Design a protein around this ligand. Structure first.
Ligand SMILES: [Zn+2]
Lengths: 7, 198
């Protein structure tokens, strides 16, 4: 499951 | 209860990523105690230099990048915080949670990156450790990493630049596309979005 993770 | 209520600290510049040599390297300009003091007073008498700053709140350290005379960073790091400056805390000039973007007037003594005009899709992400990581642009706000990295490697680099081969600004890094904690692509705020905000 791709997710956008804040860096 | 109200006397006990204090305001959140300022964002504090604690270092920079030096890119003006033949070498990229991180420099620390404030240690932990100085950072804590400065976050409270909002008064930073250090002289700022360069384009990419390392910045801290009480809970996070990340980056900020000057473009078009504004020091930009991510809302998920800075929130609505002021930034510490020589004459006290500076209120944000731009705030947009939906774009994940904030900016303050660029510090006196800082310099701005020039927006990219060459059209290159060959990009370079500058991390808080001054790693220069190749990224292939895939769309308006996305690029693929040539080498996968753990998401933990990129944590703390939001607010830093994506640069074209000539070292001009293409966007502001904000987040990684990750599967099982492995990053394979990055999400960034394009420089054209900064210009729209301005
Ligand atoms: Zn360029």
């Amino acid at each position: 499951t791709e997710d956008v993770v804040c860096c | 209860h109200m006397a006990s209520m204090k305001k959140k600290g300022s964002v504090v510049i604690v270092g920079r990523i030096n890119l003006s040599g033949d070498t990229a390297y991180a420099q620390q300009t404030r240690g932990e105690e100085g950072c804590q003091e400065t976050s409270q007073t909002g008064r930073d008498k250090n002289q700022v230099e360069g384009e990419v700053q390392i910045v801290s709140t009480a809970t996070q350290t990340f980056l900020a990048t000057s473009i078009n005379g504004v020091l930009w960073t991510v809302y998920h790091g800075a929130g609505t915080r002021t930034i510490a400056s020589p004459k006290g805390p500076v209120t944000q000039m731009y705030t947009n949670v939906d774009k994940d973007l904030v900016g303050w007037q660029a510090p006196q003594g800082s310099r701005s990156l020039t927006p990219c005009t060459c059209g290159s899709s060959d990009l370079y992400l500058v991390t808080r450790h001054a790693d220069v990581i190749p990224v292939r642009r895939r769309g308006d706000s996305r690029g693929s990493l040539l080498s996968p990295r753990p998401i933990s490697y990129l944590k703390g680099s939001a607010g830093g630049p994506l640069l074209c081969p000539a070292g001009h600004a293409v966007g502001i890094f904000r987040a990684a596309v990750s599967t099982r904690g492995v990053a394979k692509a990055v999400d960034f705020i394009p420089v054209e979005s900064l210009e729209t905000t301005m």
